[PDB]
Structure 1
Amino acid sequence: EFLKPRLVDIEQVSSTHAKVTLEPLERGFGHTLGNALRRILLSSMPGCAVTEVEIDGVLHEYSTKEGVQEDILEILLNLKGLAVRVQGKDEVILTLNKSGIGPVTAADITHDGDVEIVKPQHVICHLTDENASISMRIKVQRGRGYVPASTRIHSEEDERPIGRLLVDACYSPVERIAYNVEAARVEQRTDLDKLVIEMETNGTIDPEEAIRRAATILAEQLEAFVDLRD
């Protein structure tokens, strides 16, 4: 004699905000599904982010291209916060060519079908000389969690080039997930709760898709208890 909650309306406040509600919760299950969902979404959602950059005429990170007005150490720290969602493949290799005076925004990346940038007003660097020219070949991958450049070196496998500037990659499309259970009301039931997961992605992952991939990470894991093998 239990109740089971069903997905309800998804108020989309902005592009990076979201509010999804789980209507018919039995009493005592508010904080049980919430904190078991907030603790999964913040941890293990698969995403995509840059993995290694490569510029045309620079050898290491601490150089300084001529014409741009940032050290290369800042051009990598600006790419790391580049949000991008690839649909078909698993990894891509982007491109970026620009010349002339004016800030090189992220929207000047070469346009492919699958690769779909999300924040096209993103600044990357600046150009401040009429005969300046910056041409890089960004890389992109899928994964989850966080894997720094040092620990991703163990699987280097003879990284022959000396122009492969390595970036640290933090794939995760969530930044903060608050949730609060309140007094839901079915037509006739003394006490029913409502979960309201106020999520906030970096414009990458669909909200309703996150929960349907956070639940199957739980429901796939409880098998080891349902069948206590001994």
Structure 2
Amino acid sequence: TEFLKPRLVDIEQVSSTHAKVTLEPLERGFGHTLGNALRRILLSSMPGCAVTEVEIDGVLHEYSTKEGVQEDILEILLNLKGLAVRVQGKDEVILTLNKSGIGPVTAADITHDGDVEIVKPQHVICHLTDENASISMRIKVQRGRGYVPASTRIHSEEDERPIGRLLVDACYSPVERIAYNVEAARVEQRTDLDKLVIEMETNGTIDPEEAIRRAATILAEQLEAFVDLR
């Protein structure tokens, strides 16, 4: 056993969404071993927060039309799925949005909770055309992982059935795109030994370094069973 462990070298954060992470030195073949196994956990298993429920006033269903609003309610729900939200303390927060007058309703119009950060405040949700028009809604953000559709969520719970509650497809996973590469390491005299560049392209909330840390933790927790129980 010539155990040679890699170490986190450099995190080239080009943007808050897109960041490269270089990794060296890796012994031959471990570059692709961790590369893919991590990519899989980073795609599907990464916990995140996502808009689960919405409840707009003057709205009985998502297919209706609201006066003084360019977008149909479905297109508003779409914008709320891609609303970047980070809940710090609790798993479930129900934010309130009341806004009026002529203006594109941005994410900053939502009343921020003590422990809730709206990561992109300039994110568009709805367009108010008429000055007389006012919009009011209650946006529930819950935490989960992966992607939970509204068609899978309308066939499980349904204990309380309040008429006026629109469910939304949850985009819980924060990682949008991920693709690991391999480059020259140029260490001491290892030569063969190289590195592993993990390029991540995420939303706002989950931080590149933090996310890779969590993904390696999930893989190590699955490996407990193969180390401990034989």
TM interval, shorter chain, is over 0.9
CA contact (8 A) 1:149 1:168 kept: yes
Partner of 2:163: 162
What runs of 5+ residues in structure 1 fail to find an aligned partner?
A: none
**Offset at residue 172 of structure 1 (A):** 0.8
CA contact (8 A) 1:16 1:202 kept: yes
CA contact (8 A) 1:59 1:162 kept: yes
Partner of 1:47: 48
Secondary structure (helix, strand or coil) at the match of 1:22 reads: strand
* The structure with more strand, counted as a fraction of residues: 2
Query: Distance between the aligned counterparts of 1:47 and 1:80, measured in 2?
Result: 12
Query: Distance between the aligned counterparts of 2:82 and 2:74, measured in 1?
Result: 14
Query: Distance between the aligned counterparts of 2:161 and 2:48, measured in 1?
Result: 28
How many aligned residue pairs are there?
229
**Offset at residue 191 of structure 1 (A):** 1.9
**More moved, 163-172 vs 104-113:** 104-113
Query: Distance between the aligned counterparts of 1:64 and 1:142, measured in 2?
Result: 29
Secondary structure (helix, strand or coil) at the match of 1:50 reads: strand
Deviations 1:146-200 (A, max 9, x none): 2211221234343331100111112111111111112212223232111110111
Deviations 1:81-116 (A, max 9, x none): 111111111110111111101111111111223111
Query: Distance between the aligned counterparts of 2:194 and 2:171, measured in 1?
Result: 35
**Offset at residue 66 of structure 1 (A):** 1.1
Query: Distance between the aligned counterparts of 1:130 and 1:184, measured in 2?
Result: 61
What runs of 5+ residues in structure 2 fail to find an aligned partner?
A: none
**Offset at residue 228 of structure 1 (A):** 4.8
CA contact (8 A) 2:178 2:201 kept: yes
CA contact (8 A) 2:179 2:198 kept: yes
Normalised TM-score (structure 1): 0.94
Deviations 1:22-77 (A, max 9, x none): 12211221111111111211111000000010011111111111111221121111
Normalised TM-score (structure 2): 0.94
Partner of 1:113: 114
Query: Distance between the aligned counterparts of 1:188 and 1:216, measured in 2?
Result: 31
Query: Distance between the aligned counterparts of 2:47 and 2:58, measured in 1?
Result: 33
CA contact (8 A) 2:112 2:118 kept: no
**Offset at residue 204 of structure 1 (A):** 1.5
CA contact (8 A) 1:185 1:191 kept: no
**More moved, 217-226 vs 134-143:** 217-226
Trace 1:26-175 onto structure 2 (pairs within 5 A): 26-175=27-176
CA contact (8 A) 2:96 2:139 kept: yes
Deviations 1:2-26 (A, max 9, x none): 2101112211101101011112211
Identity of aligned residues (%): 100
